[PDB]
């Protein structure tokens, strides 16, 4: 709504909404349930940054066993993942 903080990727098109700027904090008089106030970013708008992700195998088997496996990551209810998914993950 013209004043929310977003970040867009160019190579992948990653889209997020970080929240609302503090310049519009005294605007709506009751912010509501699904918003959060963040500082407006400074500096150069276009930033390059290389980050490295280390992923275990069990994360991949628990993601690819279901439709949404990250809830199975954080709730532990994997429920005895099969073996063909394991050998396909090993092959890939």
């Amino acid at each position: 709504l013209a004043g929310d903080v977003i970040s867009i990727d160019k190579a992948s098109g990653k889209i997020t909404k970080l929240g609302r700027s503090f310049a519009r904090s005294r605007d709506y008089d009751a912010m509501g349930a699904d918003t959060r106030f963040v500082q407006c970013p400074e500096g150069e708008l276009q930033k390059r940054k290389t980050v490295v992700h280390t992923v275990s195998l069990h994360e991949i088997d628990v993601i690819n066993s279901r439709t949404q496996g990250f809830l199975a990551l954080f709730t532990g209810d994997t429920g005895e993942i099969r073996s063909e998914v394991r050998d396909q993950i090993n092959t890939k």
């Binding site: 008089d29 009751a30 954080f74 709730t75």
Partner: protein
Amino acid sequence: VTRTAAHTHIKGLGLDESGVAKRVEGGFVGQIEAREACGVIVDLIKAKKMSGRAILLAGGPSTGKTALALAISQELGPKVPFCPLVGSELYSVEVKKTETLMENFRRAIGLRIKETKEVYEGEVTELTPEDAKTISHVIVGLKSAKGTKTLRLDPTIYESIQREKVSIGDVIYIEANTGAVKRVGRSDAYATEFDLETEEYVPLPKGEVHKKKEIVQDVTLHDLDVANARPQGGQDVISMMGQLLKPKKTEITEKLRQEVNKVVAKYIDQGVAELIPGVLFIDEVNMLDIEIFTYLNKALESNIAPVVVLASNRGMTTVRGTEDVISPHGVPPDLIDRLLIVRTLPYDKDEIRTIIERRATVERLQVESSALDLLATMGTETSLRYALQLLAPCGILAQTSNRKEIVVNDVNEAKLLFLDAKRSTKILETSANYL
């Protein structure tokens, strides 16, 4: 009026500024050395520096171990978490026992969050939303008995206002920090638009429209663990009928614990939160299986583990889950090396008489000295608890004969009527067919 159940005469450990106990202070009679140990453990816990320090207090039955744990909880205060627990509770049918042990560990680490509460409530006098199909903002005017106050609101809140079926003339409840919308009902001024109506009519709020209130929120780490580990998903604010699928408890992975620790660590250094560790108290620790005793070893070495207090009343007893491991107090020798053992001596005649007098005081009963000596000799002859639990039948039998004060004959009548364990065993041995 007031209720007592084998306790509530315990107010504290009865220590002075130098850490020395009086004889009769804080509802405690005798038991000096264990009270010094408990006071030192209370000071160590209040130091707020340590993780995984353990304490086991042992002794004979009816000696005051649970009384000492409750005195620790009263001396510590209600702000610090205190988690009472029976060792039999860890055997659950939904999850494993080590999982329940970890949740009872993390239930003993609390937090203190500084929050505020601002509330708008009163008479709705204007509902004017404006666009630019999609609304831009809604201006709502609120009215109370001390004046009116108009507000600007966002369309997300307007969706909840539309959900609550709010029209002109209703009394609403707006919490600006959360975004909660609550409808109370129509006003008393609109009560005469119809003779019979299906709506409820409330008067105007007598206070101001805007109220401010400072609050302090206490949550444990286990609440933050269970808030992020819902398997079905989140729930709405008003849920009178539950979900169609039953959510059972699941074992929570260590990764979620790492993220919750990261979030709490990111919130502590900004001054928003204050970390308060607490006490996990386990009574009857001899009931535990050997695998829980082994996972207790790894759980005590964590960086966020609380101070654990255990109790037992056993001797050279085989630990459960084994066949030939004779160990003291039902604790294995691996775990007992990391423990610190506080003994609990039994009592003599005069402290038992003092305990009887103190508990007769707290139950608002008046006893003669002659009946008091009889009850003391009964307590030393049979059991302390048997002299404890005959006070209220003595009061009933005294009140039956229009007397406010206990005499010897009521004690003899309650002796004849109610039996202890040894007289029942004597009747059991000299019997024909199953008593």
